[PDB]
Amino acid sequence: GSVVIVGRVVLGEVQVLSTATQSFLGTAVNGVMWSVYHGAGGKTISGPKGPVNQMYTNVDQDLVGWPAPPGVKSLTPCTCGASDLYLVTRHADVVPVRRRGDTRGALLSPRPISTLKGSSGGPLLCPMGHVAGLFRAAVCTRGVAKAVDFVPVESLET
Ligand SMILES: CC(C)(C)[C@@H]1NC(=O)O[C@@H]2CCC[C@H]2OC/C=C/C(F)(F)c2nc3ccccc3nc2O[C@@H]2C[C@@H](C(=O)N[C@]3(C(=O)NS(=O)(=O)C4(C)CC4)C[C@H]3C(F)F)N(C2)C1=O
């Protein structure tokens, strides 16, 4: 009934999060580990110090947030306005993405949806290594991902 940290992706470190049935990612920004509601629901983040309740819960935007667990360093928000981004997956892959709006980004090369499955909550990074967005959904046709939908980093504030 809680979310557990089961690993990380070393870039800054993205957290690999798991429930009893699902696994996804968590990205710390502004002292808050953000993730997606469709993975974590309203569940707490567990750990040796005891369960911690979510401090942010938005079902409409599919965005949730816990206070960053001790040791989870926050990534730097992107302020350079880059349009060439990089999606970090749970498998440490770094998929180039061309931003085509506030919440959308086109893939330079279509990827099978299976390779992006489980990477919701991962960051989209700019050429400087700063987080410009948070992976939420994929634009899928014939089982192939041609674009992604993400929560803009501007929405990841206190
Ligand atoms: C066809 C498709 C690809 C399955 C689907 N595309 C899709 O919907 O595209 C349209 C067009 C562009 C945006 C989107 O508009 C609808 C908005 C969807 C949403 F995201 F805002 C969302 N809000 C919710 C809020 C509350 C409760 C449930 C919600 N459920 C949602 O959507 C659901 C979930 C989301 C998802 O699967 N995300 C990913 C992922 O990895 N998850 S996961 O870790 O394996 C796992 C399931 C363990 C947690 C990255 C994408 C993929 F790479 F795996 N979905 C379905 C999709 O992406």
Ligand SMILES: [Zn+2]
């Ligand atoms: Zn930047």
